[PDB]
Amino acid sequence: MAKTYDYLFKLLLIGDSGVGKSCLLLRFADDTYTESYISTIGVDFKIRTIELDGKTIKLQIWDTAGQERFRTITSSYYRGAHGIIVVYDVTDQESYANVKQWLQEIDRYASENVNKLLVGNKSDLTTKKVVDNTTAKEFADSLGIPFLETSAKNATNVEQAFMTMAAEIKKRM
Amino acid sequence: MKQEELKRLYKAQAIQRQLEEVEERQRASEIQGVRLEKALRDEAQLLQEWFKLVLEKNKLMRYESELLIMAQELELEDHQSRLEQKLREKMLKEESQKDEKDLNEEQEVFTELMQVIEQRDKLVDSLEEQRIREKAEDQH
Ligand SMILES: Nc1nc2c(ncn2[C@@H]2O[C@H](COP(=O)(O)OP(=O)(O)NP(=O)(O)O)[C@@H](O)[C@H]2O)c(=O)[nH]1
Numbered sequence A: 001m002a003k004t005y006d007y008l009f010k011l012l013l014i015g016d017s018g019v020g021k022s023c024l025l026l027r028f029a030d031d032t033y034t035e036s037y038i039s040t041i042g043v044d045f046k047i048r049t050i051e052l053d054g055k056t057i058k059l060q061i062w063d064t065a066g067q068e069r070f071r072t073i074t075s076s077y078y079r080g081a082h083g084i085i086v087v088y089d090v091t092d093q094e095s096y097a098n099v100k101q102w103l104q105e106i107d108r109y110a111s112e113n114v115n116k117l118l119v120g121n122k123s124d125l126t127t128k129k130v131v132d133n134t135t136a137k138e139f140a141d142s143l144g145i146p147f148l149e150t151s152a153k154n155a156t157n158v159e160q161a162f163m164t165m166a167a168e169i170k171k172r173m
Numbered sequence B: 001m002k003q004e005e006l007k008r009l010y011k012a013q014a015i016q017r018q019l020e021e022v023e024e025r026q027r028a029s030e031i032q033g034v035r036l037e038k039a040l041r042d043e044a045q046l047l048q049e050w051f052k053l054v055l056e057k058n059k060l061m062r063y064e065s066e067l068l069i070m071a072q073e074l075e076l077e078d079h080q081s082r083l084e085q086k087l088r089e090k091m092l093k094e095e096s097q098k099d100e101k102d103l104n105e106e107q108e109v110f111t112e113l114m115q116v117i118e119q120r121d122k123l124v125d126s127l128e129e130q131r132i133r134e135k136a137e138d139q140h
């Protein structure tokens, strides 16, 4: 029936094409998953409401295309976000390097105090993992930004990631 | 043969039956209001019945308006699904092969798709715009 909520938080997922931004959103909001790779056309969003401590928060999770052809479309939506998750692929070193450029995209187009969270997705494929958890953790600490390894495939930590993202938006404002 | 557009039409069907249940409580509620006006003439039993009726009327009013949005949301989510599919089929061609009338309607679907997503966001926002005045109304 009617869904009554305490706060609305806008979130953004950004990161290289292929790292699993859409599968994470599918896992979190619809509790599904697909091995097919369908590139995101521009942007999309989905709703999930969550119970965090006292309150019901409604999460508008925006999903952005990672392909450069859509960056001009996707940077419109940086500004009005309260929270931006930067996602990389555990089995791709260059996707973890490119985290830095996505952070500069945040500083360029987001609001000054936007919240930030780093996510190394695809933790499932232990074999071809290349980016070490501590290098990434170390990088994330001393930006004052939290960090988490997720697998949208088997569902590890993906709610934790979004919950942590919500927590830190609630501390603020 | 369909897929989790099944979730969409079940939710649609559920919302319509919920609207119908509200328009009948609204008719019922307004039939009582005219009864207690004429009983205006202890009176504590009926003064508090009309107090409950005021709240009840306001709840059904807020609830109807939200259900109507939830129904517009799923109609947009369905249109988005059709546009997105249509655009992807046009992208299967390589761009050398599409003549100028392809690009024009490929462009057209993309903007229509982005516009459908914008109205989804305008409904999300309007849900808060009405949620913000509801706490300005519940301050009493
Ligand atoms: N093993 C594994 N594969 C995953 C995981 N998450 C996503 N993938 C795979 O990686 C591919 C890319 O996922 P997708 O969500 O489409 O990527 P994206 O980040 O949205 N790309 P884009 O920016 O183009 O939309 C998919 O084929 C999916 O199967 C995960 O946790 N584990």
Ligand SMILES: [Mg+2]
Binding pocket: A021, A022, A023, A038, A039, A040
């Ligand atoms: Mg995608």
